């Protein structure tokens, strides 16, 4: 009776367009009314996307997740982007997608150049867990990953 909409939507047969649309609408409306980073309901949506897209990818949903996460991080509220990096690392481990991998590299490079390591650690973690071989890794990103190689 008290279960959160995101909890229902993450069940195997639990996702329905009707429930998700009403949930997404309220979250986005709260983000606009209360402001970026000020809506805890919006944070649950970031968390939902981070998990749900691993098993049920959809281009437009991912692109909205990505766009809002980056908007929030620019304002200084990084939960959305942390959810995105977790999606990249765990999601690409589950099923590799070339276009999503390219985004993963691009956002990791930006994250590192902004003085953060959360993205770089998640990329390094992906490399340790994934079975994917012959990856085409940005030469600049390989250089950044060199910091972690000397540590282990
Ligand atoms: C095995 N775990 C997992 N965990 C915490 O429970 C949550 C889910 O585990 P997780 O998603 O694998 O950690 P994760 O988020 O991927 O790594 P990180 O939080 O650094 O981004 C995370 O906040 C993780 O830090 C743990 N916390 C404590 N104190 N002890 C533990 O053994 C564990």
Author numbering: 794 to 945
Provide excerpts from the study.
Recently, we and others identified La-related protein 1 (LARP1) as a novel downstream target of mTORC1 and proposed that it plays an important role in the translation of TOP mRNAs. We have also shown that LARP1 associates with the 5’TOP motif via a LARP1 family-specific ‘DM15 region’ located within its C-terminus. We show that the DM15 region of LARP1 specifically binds the 7-methylguanosine 5’−5’ triphosphate (m7Gppp) moiety and the invariant first cytidine of TOP mRNAs. Biochemical analyses reveal that LARP1 selectively prevents the binding of eIF4E to the m7Gppp cap to block the assembly of the eIF4F complex on TOP mRNAs.
Our observations of (1) a binding pocket complementary to the size and shape of a guanosine that (2) specifically recognizes its Watson-Crick face, and (3) sits upstream of the 5’ terminal cytidine of the bound TOP RNA led us to hypothesize that DM15 binds the cap of TOP mRNAs. To test this, we determined the co-crystal structure of DM15 bound to the cap analog 7-methylguanosine triphosphate (m7GTP) to 1.8 Å resolution. m7GTP binds the same pocket as G8* in the DM15-RNA co-crystal. Lysine-915 stabilizes the γ-phosphate of m7GTP. Interestingly, the γ-phosphate of m7GTP aligns with the position of the bound sulfate ion that crystallized at the non-crystallographic dimer interface in the structure of the apo DM15 region. The DM15 region of LARP1 stabilizes the nucleobase of m7GTP between two conserved aromatic amino acids, Y883 and Y922. In addition, E886 hydrogen bonds with the Watson-Crick face of the guanosine moiety, using acidic side chains for this recognition in a mechanism reminiscent to that of other cap-binding proteins (CBP20). The methyl group points away from the core of the DM15 region in a manner similar to that observed in the nuclear cap-binding complex; it is therefore likely that other regions of LARP1 outside of the crystallized construct interact with the methyl group at position 7 and the 5’−5’ triphosphate linkage connecting the m7Gppp moiety and the first cytidine nucleotide of the TOP motif. While the α-helical nature of DM15 is unique among cap-binding proteins, its cap recognition pocket exhibits the canonical architecture. (C) Superimposition of DM15 bound to RNA and bound to cap analog, m7GTP.
